[PDB]
Amino acid sequence: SKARVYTEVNVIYESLIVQWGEQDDYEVVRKVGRGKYSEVFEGINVNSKEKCIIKILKPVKKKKIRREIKILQNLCGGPNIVKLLDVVRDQHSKTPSLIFEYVNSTDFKVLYPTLTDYDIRYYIYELLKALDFCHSQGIMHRDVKPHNVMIDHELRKLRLIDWGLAEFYHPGKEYNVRVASRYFKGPELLVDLQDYDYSLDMWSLGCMFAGMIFRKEPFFYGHDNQDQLVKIAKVLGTDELNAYLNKYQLELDPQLEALVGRHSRKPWSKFINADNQHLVSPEAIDFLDKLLRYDHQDRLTAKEAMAHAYFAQVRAAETSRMRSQL
């Protein structure tokens, strides 16, 4: 199982030596969040007085650290990718820090309930730009979720952040399935299919999208990794799951097989209610349906997603803006 697109980018991060900057150029002001091996801070460039994001990495595995840096530097300038400003170190202590552009973002739990139909089409399209670019550079993000999509709603600005789980794609290579966050893990991760690709990010985006238009966050709400497959099965159905398992010659553990049980496919229209109906359209459902597929090879690519009719008005507005600016 290979990818449909960008299978030969890294055919046409260990031995990486990074160029450390001065840690005194930046100062930590406020803590905003933490990670499994990182803490994130609002900071300041004491020279330019410009705000920034400071990510101090608990020096766990330097291999993982160098990987994230190599990737971020490869994506610099890319549409809607977070911009790495600098990479600095204690010089005495081993502890490194990643310096990023500041994004005055609204937390999705507050923002998403206020999004309109136009907002959703607009921001998903901006996120797709980011995924298309990094996939074109031969990179999987592997942690797409609302927390890693920073939106400054006032500036209509979106940035894809947190590239700690990002990886270079090599065709046929078997990857760690311990990636992404539970609610946004694709079927490949849950049935231990290790030769996955860019399409993993497209499932995750599909989960986010479903969450927004149905106002159901998260959409697939498993109590654990096994229950997560069950929640997916209860919507997509078990027959397409069996075809999926057969295609890639996979077998579920008998206990997991029992939990999944048997389920018919559930029409997307079942999730429509009076509260979310203004966010839902035949175009939105068609688009969603082409993202949330068991078979990663059947999912839309980022580029194919951007050409979907759902984004017709977003494209047309851009084109009209271009002609006018000419």
mmCIF file of C-alpha atoms in Angstrom:
data_model
loop_
_atom_site.group_PDB
_atom_site.id
_atom_site.type_symbol
_atom_site.label_atom_id
_atom_site.label_comp_id
_atom_site.label_asym_id
_atom_site.label_seq_id
_atom_site.Cartn_x
_atom_site.Cartn_y
_atom_site.Cartn_z
ATOM 1 C CA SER A 1 0.000 0.000 0.000
ATOM 2 C CA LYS A 2 1.508 3.268 -1.210
ATOM 3 C CA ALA A 3 0.046 6.751 -1.625
ATOM 4 C CA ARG A 4 -1.753 8.094 -4.686
ATOM 5 C CA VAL A 5 0.257 11.312 -4.564
ATOM 6 C CA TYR A 6 3.768 12.493 -3.630
ATOM 7 C CA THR A 7 5.222 8.986 -3.308
ATOM 8 C CA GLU A 8 8.591 9.996 -4.753
ATOM 9 C CA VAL A 9 9.360 13.297 -3.010
ATOM 10 C CA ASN A 10 11.841 11.786 -0.556
ATOM 11 C CA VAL A 11 13.190 9.405 -3.188
ATOM 12 C CA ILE A 12 14.213 12.065 -5.707
ATOM 13 C CA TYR A 13 16.900 14.159 10.093
ATOM 14 C CA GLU A 14 19.377 11.959 11.966
ATOM 15 C CA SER A 15 22.660 13.431 10.714
ATOM 16 C CA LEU A 16 21.243 16.956 10.998
ATOM 17 C CA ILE A 17 23.432 19.656 12.527
ATOM 18 C CA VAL A 18 21.319 22.665 13.499
ATOM 19 C CA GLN A 19 22.418 26.302 13.651
ATOM 20 C CA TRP A 20 21.715 27.509 17.194
ATOM 21 C CA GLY A 21 20.712 31.108 17.858
ATOM 22 C CA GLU A 22 21.182 33.267 20.948
ATOM 23 C CA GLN A 23 18.735 32.359 23.717
ATOM 24 C CA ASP A 24 19.031 35.857 25.185
ATOM 25 C CA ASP A 25 17.224 37.281 22.150
ATOM 26 C CA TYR A 26 13.953 35.941 23.543
ATOM 27 C CA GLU A 27 12.242 35.990 26.930
ATOM 28 C CA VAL A 28 9.363 33.980 28.365
ATOM 29 C CA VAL A 29 6.400 36.051 29.511
ATOM 30 C CA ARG A 30 3.382 33.780 30.004
ATOM 31 C CA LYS A 31 2.562 30.060 29.894
ATOM 32 C CA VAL A 32 -0.194 29.135 27.439
ATOM 33 C CA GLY A 33 0.024 25.340 27.248
ATOM 34 C CA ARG A 34 2.082 22.190 27.724
ATOM 35 C CA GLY A 35 2.755 18.958 25.853
ATOM 36 C CA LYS A 36 3.992 15.429 26.508
ATOM 37 C CA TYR A 37 7.584 16.659 26.420
ATOM 38 C CA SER A 38 7.162 20.405 25.946
ATOM 39 C CA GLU A 39 5.853 23.599 27.519
ATOM 40 C CA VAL A 40 4.627 26.487 25.401
ATOM 41 C CA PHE A 41 4.993 30.141 26.312
ATOM 42 C CA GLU A 42 4.116 33.578 25.035
ATOM 43 C CA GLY A 43 7.403 35.404 24.660
ATOM 44 C CA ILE A 44 9.129 38.512 23.403
ATOM 45 C CA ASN A 45 11.983 39.332 21.048
ATOM 46 C CA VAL A 46 13.702 41.789 23.391
ATOM 47 C CA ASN A 47 15.510 43.275 20.380
ATOM 48 C CA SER A 48 12.610 43.825 17.976
ATOM 49 C CA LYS A 49 9.993 44.032 20.755
ATOM 50 C CA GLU A 50 7.821 41.685 18.663
ATOM 51 C CA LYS A 51 5.721 38.994 20.369
ATOM 52 C CA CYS A 52 6.429 35.306 19.787
ATOM 53 C CA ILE A 53 5.715 31.741 20.843
ATOM 54 C CA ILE A 54 8.430 29.977 22.813
ATOM 55 C CA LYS A 55 8.427 26.185 22.922
ATOM 56 C CA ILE A 56 10.804 24.779 25.530
ATOM 57 C CA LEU A 57 11.437 21.096 24.860
ATOM 58 C CA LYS A 58 12.097 18.726 27.744
ATOM 59 C CA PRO A 59 15.288 17.283 26.194
ATOM 60 C CA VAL A 60 13.865 13.776 25.838
ATOM 61 C CA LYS A 61 14.946 12.408 22.464
ATOM 62 C CA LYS A 62 17.176 14.710 20.427
ATOM 63 C CA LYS A 63 16.316 12.596 17.370
ATOM 64 C CA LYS A 64 12.711 13.769 17.655
ATOM 65 C CA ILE A 65 13.885 17.338 18.300
ATOM 66 C CA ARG A 66 16.119 17.466 15.232
ATOM 67 C CA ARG A 67 13.319 15.931 13.164
ATOM 68 C CA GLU A 68 10.846 18.675 14.037
ATOM 69 C CA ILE A 69 13.442 21.345 13.232
ATOM 70 C CA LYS A 70 14.403 19.774 9.900
ATOM 71 C CA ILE A 71 10.732 19.641 8.951
ATOM 72 C CA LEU A 72 9.870 23.176 10.060
ATOM 73 C CA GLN A 73 12.805 24.561 8.125
ATOM 74 C CA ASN A 74 11.675 22.619 5.047
ATOM 75 C CA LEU A 75 8.168 24.088 5.290
ATOM 76 C CA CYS A 76 9.210 27.698 5.940
ATOM 77 C CA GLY A 77 7.297 30.161 3.777
ATOM 78 C CA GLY A 78 4.596 27.598 3.084
ATOM 79 C CA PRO A 79 0.953 28.740 3.043
ATOM 80 C CA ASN A 80 -0.621 28.768 6.517
ATOM 81 C CA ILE A 81 2.286 26.897 8.108
ATOM 82 C CA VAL A 82 3.502 28.249 11.443
ATOM 83 C CA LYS A 83 6.750 30.140 10.869
ATOM 84 C CA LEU A 84 9.785 29.080 12.867
ATOM 85 C CA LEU A 85 11.611 32.283 13.807
ATOM 86 C CA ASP A 86 14.601 30.760 15.575
ATOM 87 C CA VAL A 87 16.154 27.755 17.291
ATOM 88 C CA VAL A 88 18.038 28.494 20.505
ATOM 89 C CA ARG A 89 19.762 26.638 23.340
ATOM 90 C CA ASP A 90 21.014 27.154 26.907
ATOM 91 C CA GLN A 91 24.627 26.577 25.717
ATOM 92 C CA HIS A 92 25.341 25.188 29.195
ATOM 93 C CA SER A 93 22.223 23.079 29.718
ATOM 94 C CA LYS A 94 21.136 20.857 26.831
ATOM 95 C CA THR A 95 17.580 22.246 26.888
ATOM 96 C CA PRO A 96 16.593 23.684 23.455
ATOM 97 C CA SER A 97 13.787 26.109 22.602
ATOM 98 C CA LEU A 98 11.789 26.625 19.401
ATOM 99 C CA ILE A 99 10.750 30.214 18.646
ATOM 100 C CA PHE A 100 7.592 30.747 16.558
ATOM 101 C CA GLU A 101 5.502 33.615 15.186
ATOM 102 C CA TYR A 102 2.809 34.663 17.635
ATOM 103 C CA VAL A 103 -0.774 33.905 16.620
ATOM 104 C CA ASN A 104 -3.485 35.756 18.535
ATOM 105 C CA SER A 105 -5.749 32.709 18.373
ATOM 106 C CA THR A 106 -9.178 31.980 19.816
ATOM 107 C CA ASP A 107 -9.537 28.562 21.458
ATOM 108 C CA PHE A 108 -11.661 26.301 19.275
ATOM 109 C CA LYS A 109 -14.052 25.424 22.103
ATOM 110 C CA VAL A 110 -15.044 29.079 22.170
ATOM 111 C CA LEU A 111 -14.592 29.820 18.473
ATOM 112 C CA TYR A 112 -16.256 26.824 16.798
ATOM 113 C CA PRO A 113 -19.771 27.330 18.226
ATOM 114 C CA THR A 114 -19.716 30.820 16.667
ATOM 115 C CA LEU A 115 -18.540 29.831 13.190
ATOM 116 C CA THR A 116 -20.859 30.448 10.253
ATOM 117 C CA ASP A 117 -21.261 28.422 7.064
ATOM 118 C CA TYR A 118 -18.939 30.835 5.254
ATOM 119 C CA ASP A 119 -16.389 30.662 8.122
ATOM 120 C CA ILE A 120 -16.163 26.889 7.968
ATOM 121 C CA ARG A 121 -15.710 26.838 4.168
ATOM 122 C CA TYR A 122 -13.112 29.583 4.455
ATOM 123 C CA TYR A 123 -10.952 28.106 7.267
ATOM 124 C CA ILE A 124 -11.111 24.495 6.082
ATOM 125 C CA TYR A 125 -9.881 25.778 2.739
ATOM 126 C CA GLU A 126 -7.010 27.586 4.495
ATOM 127 C CA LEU A 127 -6.141 24.387 6.370
ATOM 128 C CA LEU A 128 -6.202 22.448 3.089
ATOM 129 C CA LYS A 129 -3.633 24.877 1.651
ATOM 130 C CA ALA A 130 -1.326 23.926 4.536
ATOM 131 C CA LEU A 131 -1.861 20.189 4.112
ATOM 132 C CA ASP A 132 -1.409 20.365 0.338
ATOM 133 C CA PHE A 133 1.897 22.169 0.750
ATOM 134 C CA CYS A 134 3.446 19.949 3.421
ATOM 135 C CA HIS A 135 2.252 16.823 1.601
ATOM 136 C CA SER A 136 3.823 18.226 -1.576
ATOM 137 C CA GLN A 137 7.077 18.632 0.392
ATOM 138 C CA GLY A 138 6.793 14.950 1.297
ATOM 139 C CA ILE A 139 5.684 15.511 4.890
ATOM 140 C CA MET A 140 2.847 14.033 6.960
ATOM 141 C CA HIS A 141 1.659 16.139 9.893
ATOM 142 C CA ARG A 142 0.121 13.189 11.772
ATOM 143 C CA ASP A 143 -1.493 15.351 14.482
ATOM 144 C CA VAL A 144 -4.267 17.323 12.796
ATOM 145 C CA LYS A 145 -6.854 18.382 15.385
ATOM 146 C CA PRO A 146 -8.557 21.654 16.426
ATOM 147 C CA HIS A 147 -5.870 22.338 19.059
ATOM 148 C CA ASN A 148 -3.145 22.301 16.397
ATOM 149 C CA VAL A 149 -5.034 24.596 14.054
ATOM 150 C CA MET A 150 -4.522 28.107 15.411
ATOM 151 C CA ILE A 151 -7.144 30.576 14.200
ATOM 152 C CA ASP A 152 -6.924 34.339 14.721
ATOM 153 C CA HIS A 153 -10.587 34.927 13.931
ATOM 154 C CA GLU A 154 -10.263 38.705 13.760
ATOM 155 C CA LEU A 155 -7.476 38.523 11.191
ATOM 156 C CA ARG A 156 -9.113 35.626 9.334
ATOM 157 C CA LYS A 157 -5.734 33.947 9.796
ATOM 158 C CA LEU A 158 -5.048 30.226 10.191
ATOM 159 C CA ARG A 159 -1.798 28.488 11.063
ATOM 160 C CA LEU A 160 -1.084 24.776 11.306
ATOM 161 C CA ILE A 161 1.168 24.229 14.315
ATOM 162 C CA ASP A 162 2.827 21.564 16.492
ATOM 163 C CA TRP A 163 4.941 19.541 14.066
ATOM 164 C CA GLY A 164 6.382 17.308 16.790
ATOM 165 C CA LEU A 165 4.758 14.180 15.331
ATOM 166 C CA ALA A 166 5.462 15.142 11.709
ATOM 167 C CA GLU A 167 7.415 12.700 9.555
ATOM 168 C CA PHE A 168 8.875 12.422 6.056
ATOM 169 C CA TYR A 169 6.933 10.020 3.823
ATOM 170 C CA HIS A 170 8.774 7.119 2.214
ATOM 171 C CA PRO A 171 6.707 4.693 0.094
ATOM 172 C CA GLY A 172 6.181 1.265 1.650
ATOM 173 C CA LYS A 173 7.832 2.314 4.904
ATOM 174 C CA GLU A 174 6.097 1.046 8.037
ATOM 175 C CA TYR A 175 5.410 3.851 10.517
ATOM 176 C CA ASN A 176 4.609 4.114 14.221
ATOM 177 C CA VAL A 177 0.843 3.940 14.742
ATOM 178 C CA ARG A 178 1.181 5.789 18.042
ATOM 179 C CA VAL A 179 0.527 9.132 16.326
ATOM 180 C CA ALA A 180 -2.292 11.729 16.298
ATOM 181 C CA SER A 181 -4.814 12.261 19.105
ATOM 182 C CA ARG A 182 -7.437 9.610 19.899
ATOM 183 C CA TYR A 183 -10.493 11.318 18.392
ATOM 184 C CA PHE A 184 -8.664 12.055 15.131
ATOM 185 C CA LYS A 185 -6.864 8.749 14.645
ATOM 186 C CA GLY A 186 -7.751 7.174 11.310
ATOM 187 C CA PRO A 187 -8.737 3.487 10.899
ATOM 188 C CA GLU A 188 -5.196 2.642 9.748
ATOM 189 C CA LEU A 189 -3.869 3.605 13.166
ATOM 190 C CA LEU A 190 -6.598 1.644 14.944
ATOM 191 C CA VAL A 191 -6.232 -1.631 13.008
ATOM 192 C CA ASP A 192 -2.421 -1.496 13.133
ATOM 193 C CA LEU A 193 -1.871 -0.749 9.448
ATOM 194 C CA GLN A 194 1.663 0.650 9.492
ATOM 195 C CA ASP A 195 2.265 1.605 5.852
ATOM 196 C CA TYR A 196 0.046 4.663 5.909
ATOM 197 C CA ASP A 197 0.617 7.986 4.143
ATOM 198 C CA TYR A 198 -0.572 11.589 3.767
ATOM 199 C CA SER A 199 -4.169 10.341 3.703
ATOM 200 C CA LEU A 200 -3.985 9.963 7.481
ATOM 201 C CA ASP A 201 -4.158 13.758 7.764
ATOM 202 C CA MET A 202 -7.226 13.786 5.519
ATOM 203 C CA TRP A 203 -9.146 11.491 7.858
ATOM 204 C CA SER A 204 -8.248 13.813 10.759
ATOM 205 C CA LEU A 205 -9.451 16.847 8.823
ATOM 206 C CA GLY A 206 -12.629 14.912 8.063
ATOM 207 C CA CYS A 207 -13.220 14.421 11.795
ATOM 208 C CA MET A 208 -12.704 18.127 12.487
ATOM 209 C CA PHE A 209 -15.012 19.079 9.597
ATOM 210 C CA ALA A 210 -17.777 16.752 10.806
ATOM 211 C CA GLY A 211 -17.373 18.191 14.293
ATOM 212 C CA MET A 212 -17.890 21.740 13.005
ATOM 213 C CA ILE A 213 -20.817 21.365 10.602
ATOM 214 C CA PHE A 214 -22.721 19.096 12.991
ATOM 215 C CA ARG A 215 -21.597 21.015 16.093
ATOM 216 C CA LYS A 216 -20.518 17.745 17.679
ATOM 217 C CA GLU A 217 -17.019 17.980 19.142
ATOM 218 C CA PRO A 218 -15.473 15.589 18.975
ATOM 219 C CA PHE A 219 -17.432 13.734 16.301
ATOM 220 C CA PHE A 220 -15.977 10.297 17.064
ATOM 221 C CA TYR A 221 -15.846 10.143 20.873
ATOM 222 C CA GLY A 222 -14.193 6.909 21.996
ATOM 223 C CA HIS A 223 -13.459 6.165 25.654
ATOM 224 C CA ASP A 224 -10.278 4.411 24.502
ATOM 225 C CA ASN A 225 -8.419 3.327 21.353
ATOM 226 C CA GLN A 226 -10.502 0.177 20.863
ATOM 227 C CA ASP A 227 -13.766 2.024 21.524
ATOM 228 C CA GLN A 228 -12.611 4.619 19.012
ATOM 229 C CA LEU A 229 -12.808 2.034 16.228
ATOM 230 C CA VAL A 230 -16.235 1.036 17.522
ATOM 231 C CA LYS A 231 -17.516 4.606 17.331
ATOM 232 C CA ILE A 232 -16.335 4.863 13.720
ATOM 233 C CA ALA A 233 -17.898 1.479 12.899
ATOM 234 C CA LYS A 234 -21.237 2.659 14.300
ATOM 235 C CA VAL A 235 -21.343 5.349 11.590
ATOM 236 C CA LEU A 236 -19.495 4.013 8.543
ATOM 237 C CA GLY A 237 -20.804 0.496 9.149
ATOM 238 C CA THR A 238 -19.105 -2.870 9.565
ATOM 239 C CA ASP A 239 -19.442 -4.127 5.969
ATOM 240 C CA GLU A 240 -17.097 -1.477 4.550
ATOM 241 C CA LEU A 241 -14.840 -2.252 7.514
ATOM 242 C CA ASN A 242 -14.674 -5.903 6.444
ATOM 243 C CA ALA A 243 -13.830 -4.911 2.867
ATOM 244 C CA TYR A 244 -11.151 -2.621 4.285
ATOM 245 C CA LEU A 245 -9.739 -5.388 6.469
ATOM 246 C CA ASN A 246 -9.747 -7.763 3.495
ATOM 247 C CA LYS A 247 -8.048 -5.340 1.111
ATOM 248 C CA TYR A 248 -5.054 -4.918 3.405
ATOM 249 C CA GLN A 249 -5.325 -8.466 4.771
ATOM 250 C CA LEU A 250 -5.843 -7.409 8.379
ATOM 251 C CA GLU A 251 -7.542 -9.262 11.214
ATOM 252 C CA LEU A 252 -9.050 -7.666 14.303
ATOM 253 C CA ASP A 253 -8.386 -9.076 17.761
ATOM 254 C CA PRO A 254 -11.329 -11.341 18.731
ATOM 255 C CA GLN A 255 -12.159 -9.098 21.696
ATOM 256 C CA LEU A 256 -12.099 -5.944 19.570
ATOM 257 C CA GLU A 257 -14.052 -7.876 16.929
ATOM 258 C CA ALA A 258 -16.737 -8.536 19.552
ATOM 259 C CA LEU A 259 -16.942 -4.875 20.607
ATOM 260 C CA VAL A 260 -17.253 -3.656 17.010
ATOM 261 C CA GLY A 261 -20.118 -6.072 16.420
ATOM 262 C CA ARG A 262 -22.273 -5.490 13.363
ATOM 263 C CA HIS A 263 -23.615 -2.133 12.214
ATOM 264 C CA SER A 264 -25.264 -0.721 9.122
ATOM 265 C CA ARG A 265 -23.940 2.477 7.595
ATOM 266 C CA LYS A 266 -25.565 5.538 9.128
ATOM 267 C CA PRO A 267 -26.718 8.280 6.713
ATOM 268 C CA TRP A 268 -24.979 11.615 7.285
ATOM 269 C CA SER A 269 -28.423 13.236 7.375
ATOM 270 C CA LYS A 270 -28.980 11.578 10.753
ATOM 271 C CA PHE A 271 -26.624 14.094 12.347
ATOM 272 C CA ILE A 272 -28.561 17.091 11.032
ATOM 273 C CA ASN A 273 -30.694 18.925 13.588
ATOM 274 C CA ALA A 274 -32.362 22.325 14.025
ATOM 275 C CA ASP A 275 -29.198 23.638 15.684
ATOM 276 C CA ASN A 276 -26.673 22.756 12.965
ATOM 277 C CA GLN A 277 -28.832 22.780 9.822
ATOM 278 C CA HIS A 278 -27.539 26.191 8.754
ATOM 279 C CA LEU A 279 -24.050 24.697 8.525
ATOM 280 C CA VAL A 280 -25.084 21.658 6.508
ATOM 281 C CA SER A 281 -25.656 21.361 2.766
ATOM 282 C CA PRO A 282 -25.573 18.602 0.146
ATOM 283 C CA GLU A 283 -22.122 19.882 -0.871
ATOM 284 C CA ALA A 284 -20.856 19.699 2.725
ATOM 285 C CA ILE A 285 -22.113 16.154 3.148
ATOM 286 C CA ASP A 286 -20.657 15.017 -0.171
ATOM 287 C CA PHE A 287 -17.273 16.485 0.843
ATOM 288 C CA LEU A 288 -17.441 14.907 4.290
ATOM 289 C CA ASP A 289 -18.376 11.547 2.797
ATOM 290 C CA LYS A 290 -15.274 11.593 0.589
ATOM 291 C CA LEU A 291 -12.999 12.229 3.608
ATOM 292 C CA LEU A 292 -14.389 9.779 6.161
ATOM 293 C CA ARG A 293 -13.610 6.496 4.373
ATOM 294 C CA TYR A 294 -11.957 3.450 5.927
ATOM 295 C CA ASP A 295 -9.702 2.977 2.938
ATOM 296 C CA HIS A 296 -7.067 5.692 3.063
ATOM 297 C CA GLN A 297 -6.468 5.187 -0.663
ATOM 298 C CA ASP A 298 -10.107 6.112 -1.334
ATOM 299 C CA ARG A 299 -9.978 9.419 0.558
ATOM 300 C CA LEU A 300 -9.646 12.746 -1.243
ATOM 301 C CA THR A 301 -6.127 14.181 -1.444
ATOM 302 C CA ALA A 302 -5.631 17.713 -0.139
ATOM 303 C CA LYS A 303 -5.542 19.014 -3.727
ATOM 304 C CA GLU A 304 -8.658 17.068 -4.695
ATOM 305 C CA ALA A 305 -10.354 18.366 -1.553
ATOM 306 C CA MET A 306 -9.654 21.976 -2.578
ATOM 307 C CA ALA A 307 -11.295 21.360 -5.978
ATOM 308 C CA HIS A 308 -14.509 20.098 -4.349
ATOM 309 C CA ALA A 309 -17.721 22.018 -5.095
ATOM 310 C CA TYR A 310 -18.034 22.805 -1.377
ATOM 311 C CA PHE A 311 -15.285 25.412 -1.842
ATOM 312 C CA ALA A 312 -16.635 26.879 -5.090
ATOM 313 C CA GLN A 313 -17.588 30.209 -3.474
ATOM 314 C CA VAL A 314 -14.261 30.411 -1.624
ATOM 315 C CA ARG A 315 -12.311 29.875 -4.850
ATOM 316 C CA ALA A 316 -14.567 32.209 -6.830
ATOM 317 C CA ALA A 317 -14.084 34.974 -4.256
ATOM 318 C CA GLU A 318 -10.290 34.579 -4.513
ATOM 319 C CA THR A 319 -10.384 34.693 -8.306
ATOM 320 C CA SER A 320 -12.598 37.797 -8.219
ATOM 321 C CA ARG A 321 -10.221 39.434 -5.729
ATOM 322 C CA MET A 322 -7.303 38.671 -8.064
ATOM 323 C CA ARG A 323 -8.953 40.189 -11.157
ATOM 324 C CA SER A 324 -9.838 43.326 -9.199
ATOM 325 C CA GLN A 325 -6.343 43.684 -7.725
ATOM 326 C CA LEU A 326 -4.915 43.480 -11.238
#
